[PDB]
Amino acid sequence: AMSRSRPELGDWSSPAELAELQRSQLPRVLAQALRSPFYAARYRGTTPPRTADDFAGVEVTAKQDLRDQYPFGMLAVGREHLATYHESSGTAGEPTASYYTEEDWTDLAERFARKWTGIHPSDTFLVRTPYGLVITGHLAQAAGRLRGATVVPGDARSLATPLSRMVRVLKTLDVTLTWCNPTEITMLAAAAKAAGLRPDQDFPHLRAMFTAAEPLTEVRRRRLSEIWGGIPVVEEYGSTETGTIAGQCPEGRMHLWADRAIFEVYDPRTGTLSEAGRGQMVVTPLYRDAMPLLRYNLADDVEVSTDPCGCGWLLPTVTVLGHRIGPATVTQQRLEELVFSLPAAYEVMFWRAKAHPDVLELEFEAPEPVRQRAVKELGAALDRELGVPHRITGLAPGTLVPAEALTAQRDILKARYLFAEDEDWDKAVMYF
Amino acid sequence: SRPELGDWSSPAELAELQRSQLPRVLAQALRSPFYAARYRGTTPPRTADDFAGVEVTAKQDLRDQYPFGMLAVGREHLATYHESSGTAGEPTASYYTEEDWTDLAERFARKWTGIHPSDTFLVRTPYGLVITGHLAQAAGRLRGATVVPGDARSLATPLSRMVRVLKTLDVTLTWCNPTEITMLAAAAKAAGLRPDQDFPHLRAMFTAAEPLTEVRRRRLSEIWGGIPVVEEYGSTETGTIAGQCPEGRMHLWADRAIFEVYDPRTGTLSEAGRGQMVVTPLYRDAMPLLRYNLADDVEVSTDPCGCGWLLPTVTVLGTGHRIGPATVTQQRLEELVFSLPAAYEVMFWRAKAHPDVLELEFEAPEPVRQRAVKELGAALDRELGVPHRITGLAPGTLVPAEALTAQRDILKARYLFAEDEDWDKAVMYF
Ligand SMILES: Nc1ncnc2c1ncn2[C@@H]1O[C@H](COP(=O)(O)O)[C@@H](O)[C@H]1O
Ligand SMILES: O=C(O)c1ccccc1O
Ligand SMILES: O=C(O)c1ccccc1O
Ligand SMILES: O=C(O)c1ccccc1O
Ligand SMILES: O=C(O)c1ccccc1O
Ligand SMILES: [Mg+2]
Ligand SMILES: [Mg+2]
Ligand SMILES: [Zn+2]
Ligand SMILES: [Zn+2]
């Protein structure tokens, strides 16, 4: 590496060489970790870990530790070196703070930019995740700028950017790439149809859709691809606290970015850490100064395999998993496979289910002509695959996902205090 | 590379710094479909002298050329794409190269209070398509300040959460519109924090996007413990084109753009006086603008300022209503509302011009309400002489308690729920 310090795919040719690329960083990482109040307090009366060998003995860092240290208990650098500050999704009541130096950001941007489809100057990249405190909009934008793509900041959950306006942007700007959660991929598809555009034909420049943030079955991922004309739906896995830790290969598996972090699986029964198997995703990022994390337990239920993939990347794969009803165990993943196995022509995208002690209640939207078939087929799928008692109800479109979410436009107004006689002064101080 | 405050020592040297860029700027402008079509079949302007004759560019031209009619570079050289606030029905597209962004970031970073690594900077403006959030964030990154991306109009970041962030992160700088400054002050009290005492690290508040009287600006400062409220002037299409000096005048960033005043009656352009703000940015390659008429009503003065910056000053107006004998502007009413004593806590108000009467409502606590109505009535009598119907309202009437106190979990879509959970958050989870 003449110019770059941080590793790339191909700097190692064996699992043995990957482990050495990792362990060589641990002295710096362990020295940096001890600079934070949290780790200096953890190792108070003892000898701190310093060497790659000492790492074996290092205690897990829990989500609750990150919350107890709010806001800067995990901080290992002077505040003058921070570039951005972030907070996690979930509960507003117990915030999880994350923060990054400029150089931390180069590692974050590189990991997001590991998109098998590429990101190029030729791309127009719609970033359709929130920019409010969470990292996700900032992360995609930073990766877009790193690779020279035109970034369209769509934001998400903003009154400035309803779906109708995103559909017009996708079409008229010839957008080539999107970043949004998998539910937003279906929201955009429904908004396109309500504008009289066919997601499968009317966006010929759209070449890939980047997604994360929800457990996503291959059956649902394939349907989302088919809705949008058979283009790749490129999954990644991360968190505000870690950045992107795994990205899809051309074969459709997520591979751990183990050159940039030590990945371990925590068995909460035994409290053992292992390089692979089923249990809780544990991460030690190797290229971060501001907020060192030693064996941070994301508490996501994962399966990590060192088994080779068809792609040939020399990295482990990860599946992210994320209610029992009499004899059967019913998961969202299993129901999602059954819902998204209904024929595409039935247009079933929006659904929800509740586990009662004795019965699974499930609702979905479908057009009237196909609704009774969709109810019957999905019932028979549940009988055949799970054998749970069910109450399935088909609903009119606009019942779960209202028409106004899909078609309403909103002016981006500023506060006004003086109105003409014929104006609505309801928009005076509450103008959003 | 690009000029800094102090690189010119006279108005004559400033004009030379400008005119020297015009050949490049005029050549770049002609690369766009719009300007190539405008000067089709004629000889195009090429020299600093030719600039005098150049036709104004209207906001309607930017709308008519949606999306990339104003584009002077290959799309491969674009860094970001933006759209303006106002009507959703007629989008105004703008776009910038990486080098365009350095000029934008430098102009925003011209804050007389500075932006430093020692700063923690809450950006509380939208990131959704408009430039505003992205502009403040790029300036914070340029100057090394810790950027806290608050966003605005996002379900992710309600006022209650911004107030907790202001306090617990020791935020030193904010960027938000002047109404948001009062919204945050009301939200702070609802969270049990006194804006005038409980934010000791807050040192300055940056604001723009509303016509702002000195009387209102001073009150916003007093609400937040007497710290500077630093106004700038800009637009979603240009970024910051003027910034406040320590004397409280906004100075035009004329080293980065030629500023002219348009008389719409005659279509005469002038270096100073009354009329419509016209801007020709000098360091803007993706989307060249020749004499872009912002259509803001402004007064430009070349008079020297005590601050010692050798740049013209600008006052920004906004067009008001006849009510019997008198003409009432928002700015005039705002001066009267914000001349009520601070202890009355009149911040939220609205008014309607009828042909015969000014209807005005504001929130004030019950003990002060009748005095506030009487004093404000006498101010209107004394200053405007318009008939008025003034009503005092309970706090929570114009700005509801919910907007100030509601917390909102940042949920993701969920499809399987337990019996006792709210499944209304399944697909509509915002
Ligand atoms: N591709 C994915 N599949 C499943 N869950 C995901 C995926 N990406 C992100 N997540 C979830 O989202 C979390 C990130 O949370 P946050 O930092 O609050 O945005 C992860 O810890 C997972 O629980
Ligand atoms: O909410 C989202 O849209 C989202 C998308 C990707 C990653 C994290 C997120 O919160
Ligand atoms: O869920 C997230 O916040 C997230 C953040 C970074 C990258 C991928 C992700 O899903
Ligand atoms: O909407 C805002 O809060 C705002 C603030 C500053 C400048 C432009 C803006 O729209
Ligand atoms: O919209 C504004 O009034 C504004 C002001 C300064 C900078 C960016 C902006 O959009
Ligand atoms: Mg580019
Ligand atoms: Mg810094
Ligand atoms: Zn693979
Ligand atoms: Zn001055």
- Secondary structure of B34-79 as H, E, C letters: HHHHHCCCCCCCCCCCHHHHCCCEEHHHHHHCCCCCCCCCCHHHCC
Q: Which residue has the tokens 């008001």?
A: B320
List CB contacts (< 8 A) between B186 and chain A: none
Residue A328: exposed, middle, or buried by beta-carbon count in 10 A (0-12, 13-18, 19+)? middle
Which residue CA neighbors atom 8 of ligand 2 most closely? A213
Q: Looking at chain A, how many residues does it have?
A: 432
Rounded Cα distance between B7 and A338, Å, is 69
List CB contacts (< 8 A) between B179 and chain A: 414-415, 429, 431
Of B104, B160, B94, B102, which Cα lies nearest the Cα of B129?
Answer: B94
Q: How far is CA A188 from CA A55, A126, A250, A367, A392, in A?
A: 46, 12, 24, 18, 26
Instruction: Say yes or no: CB of residue A135 within 6 Å of ligand 3.
Output: yes
Tokens representing residue A175 in the block: 């957008």
Rounded Cα distance between A243 and B70, Å, is 37
Q: Which residue has the tokens 């058979």?
A: A230
Give the residue on A whose Cα is nearest the Cα of B125: A132
Tokens representing residue B274 in the block: 């009354």
- Give the single-character DSSP code of B237: T
Strand B416-418 to A324-325 pairing: unpaired
Tokens representing residue A53 in the block: 């060998």
- The 10 Å CB-count burial string (b at 16+, else e) for A92-129 is beebbbbbbbeebbbbbbbbbbbbbbebeeebbbbbbb
Tokens representing residue A64 in the block: 């609750």
Q: How far is CA B192 from CA A275, B169, B198, B224, B394, in A?
A: 48, 17, 10, 15, 19
Cα torsion A170, A172, A174, A175: sign: negative
Rounded Cα distance between A257 and A110, Å, is 11
Å between A420 CA and nearest CA of chain B: 5
Backbone angles phi and psi of B296, in degrees to 5: -85, 140
Q: Which residue has the tokens 């405008």?
A: B38
Cis amide leading into B281 (omega within 30): no
- Give the single-character DSSP code of B140: H
Rounded Cα distance between B5 and B10, Å, is 12
Whole-number Å distance, alpha carbon B411 to ligand 3 midpoint, is 13
Contacts A–B by Cβ distance under 8 A: 270
- Whether A421 has its CB under 8 Å from any CB of chain B: the answer is yes
List CB contacts (< 8 A) between A135 and chain B: none
Cα atoms found within 13 Å of the Cα of residue A118, Cβ hemisphere only:
7
Cα atoms found within 13 Å of the Cα of residue A272, Cβ hemisphere only:
6
| Residue B117 marked in a binding site | yes
Q: Looking at chain B, how many residues does it have?
A: 430
Whole-number Å distance, alpha carbon A88 to ligand 2 midpoint, is 10
Rounded Cα distance between A404 and A402, Å, is 5
Rounded Cα distance between A189 and A178, Å, is 13
Backbone angles phi and psi of B90, in degrees to 5: -130, 85
Tokens representing residue A159 in the block: 């009154």
Q: Which residues are CB-neighbours of B259 under 8 A, at least 6 positions away?
A: B241, B252, B271, B277, B278, B279, B300, B312, B314
Query: Is the distance from CB of B338 to CB of B212 less than 8 angstroms?
Result: no
Cα atoms found within 13 Å of the Cα of residue B273, Cβ hemisphere only:
8
- The 10 Å CB-count burial string (b at 16+, else e) for B388-409 is bebebbebeebbeeebbeeeee
Rounded Cα distance between A371 and A378, Å, is 11
Residues with CB under 5 A from ligand 8 (ion): A 249, 251, 253, 309, 311
List CB contacts (< 8 A) between A169 and chain B: 129
Chain gaps in chain A, named by the residue before each (C–N > 2.5 Å):
322
- Give the single-character DSSP code of B177: -
Å between B167 CA and nearest CA of chain A: 11
Helix/strand/coil for B9: coil
Cα atoms found within 13 Å of the Cα of residue A264, Cβ hemisphere only:
24
Cα atoms found within 13 Å of the Cα of residue A220, Cβ hemisphere only:
25
Query: Is the distance from CB of B230 to CB of B246 less than 8 angstroms?
Result: no
| Cβ atoms within 10 Å, residue A216 | 23
Cα torsion B26, B30, B33, B36: sign: positive
Rounded Cα distance between B13 and B23, Å, is 17
* CA A116 to chain CA centroid, nearest Å: 17
Rg, Å, chain A Cα set: 24
Ligand index nearest the alpha carbon of residue A116: 8
Instruction: Say yes or no: CB of residue A88 within 6 Å of ligand 3.
Output: no
Whole-number Å distance, alpha carbon A315 to ligand 7 midpoint, is 34
Å between A407 CA and nearest CA of chain B: 12
Residue type, B75: R
Instruction: Say yes or no: CB of residue A282 within 6 Å of ligand 1.
Output: no
| Cβ atoms within 10 Å, residue B318 | 14
Whole-number Å distance, alpha carbon A244 to ligand 3 midpoint, is 6
Helix/strand/coil for B160: helix
| Residue B232 marked in a binding site | yes
- Name the method of structure determination: X-ray
| Cβ atoms within 10 Å, residue A312 | 10
Q: Where are the domains of chain A?
A: 1-322, 323-400
Of B246, B225, B425, B429, which Cα lies nearest the Cα of B342?
Answer: B225
Q: Which residues are CB-neighbours of A196 under 8 A, at least 6 positions away?
A: none
| Cβ atoms within 10 Å, residue A230 | 9
List CB contacts (< 8 A) between B75 and chain A: 122, 124, 150
Report the nearest atom of ligand 5 relative to the CA of B232: 6
Rounded Cα distance between B84 and A61, Å, is 45
- Whether A324 has its CB under 8 Å from any CB of chain B: the answer is no
Which residue CA neighbors atom 9 of ligand 4 most closely? B209
Tokens representing residue B265 in the block: 């009656």
Of A236, A242, A240, which Cα lies nearest the Cα of A284?
Answer: A242
Dihedral angle, C-alpha A162, A165, A170, A173, nearest 10 °: -140
Q: Which residues are CB-neighbours of A370 under 8 A, at least 6 positions away?
A: A345, A346, A347
Q: Contact A151/B79, CB-based, under 8 Å?
A: yes
Cα torsion B297, B152, A419, B217: sign: negative
| Residue B231 marked in a binding site | yes
Residue type, A388: V
Q: Contact B333/A418, CB-based, under 8 Å?
A: yes
Tokens representing residue B94 in the block: 């703008």
Å between A164 CA and nearest CA of chain B: 10
What end-to-end distance do the CA atoms of chain B give, in Å? 45
Residue type, B119: D
Q: How far is CA B65 from CA B27, B70, B83, in A?
A: 19, 6, 13
Tell me, letter by letter, the H, E, C secondary structure of chain A: CCCCCCCCCCCCCCHHHHHHHHHCCHHHHHHHHCCCHHHHHHCCCCCCCCCCCHHHHCCCEEHHHHHHCCCCCCCCCCHHHCCEEEECCECCCCCCEEEECHHHHHHHHHHHCCCCCCCCCCCEEEECCCCCCCCHHHHHHHHHHHHCCEEEECCCCECCCCHHHHHHHHHHCCCCEEECCHHHHHHHHHHHHHCCCCCCCCCCCCCEEEECCCCCCHHHHHHHHHHCCCCCEEEEEEECCCEEEEEECCCCCEEECCCCEEEEEEECCCCEEECCEEEEEEEEECCCCCCCCCCEEEEEEEEEECCCCCCCCCCCEEEECCCEECCEECCHHHHHHHHCCCCHHHCCCCEEEEECCCCEEEEEECCHHHHHHHHHHHHHHHHHHCCCCEEEEEECCCCCCCHHHHHCCCCECCCCCEEECCCCHHHCCCCC
Q: Which residues are CB-neighbours of A255 under 8 A, at least 6 positions away?
A: A246, A247, A248, A249, A309, A311, A313, A315, A316, A317, A318
Rounded Cα distance between A285 and A264, Å, is 11
Whole-number Å distance, alpha carbon A260 to ligand 8 midpoint, is 17
Tokens representing residue B58 in the block: 């209207």
Query: Is the distance from CB of B281 to CB of B289 less than 8 angstroms?
Result: yes
Helix (H) or strand (E) holding B189: helix B178-190
Helix (H) or strand (E) holding B121: strand B120-123
Rounded Cα distance between B227 and B173, Å, is 10
- Give the single-character DSSP code of B125: S
Q: Which residues are CB-neighbours of A399 under 8 A, at least 6 positions away?
A: A365
Rg, Å, chain B Cα set: 24
Rounded Cα distance between A317 and A309, Å, is 8
Q: Which residues are CB-neighbours of B379 under 8 A, at least 6 positions away?
A: B336, B339
Cα atoms found within 13 Å of the Cα of residue A368, Cβ hemisphere only:
0
Query: Is the distance from CB of A363 to CB of A351 less than 8 angstroms?
Result: yes
Rounded Cα distance between B56 and B289, Å, is 9
* CA angle (B398 as vertex; B393, B404 as ends), nearest 5: 120
Q: Which residue has the tokens 């989008």?
A: B91
Rounded Cα distance between A51 and B86, Å, is 59
* CA angle (B246 as vertex; B245, B252 as ends), nearest 5: 5
Residues with CB under 5 A from ligand 7 (ion): A 82; B 117, 144
- Whether B410 has its CB under 8 Å from any CB of chain A: the answer is yes
Tokens representing residue B163 in the block: 């107030």
- Return the axis-axis angle of helices A136-147 and A102-112, rounded to nearest 10°: 80
Tokens representing residue B313 in the block: 């000053």
Cα torsion B149, B150, B154, B157: sign: positive
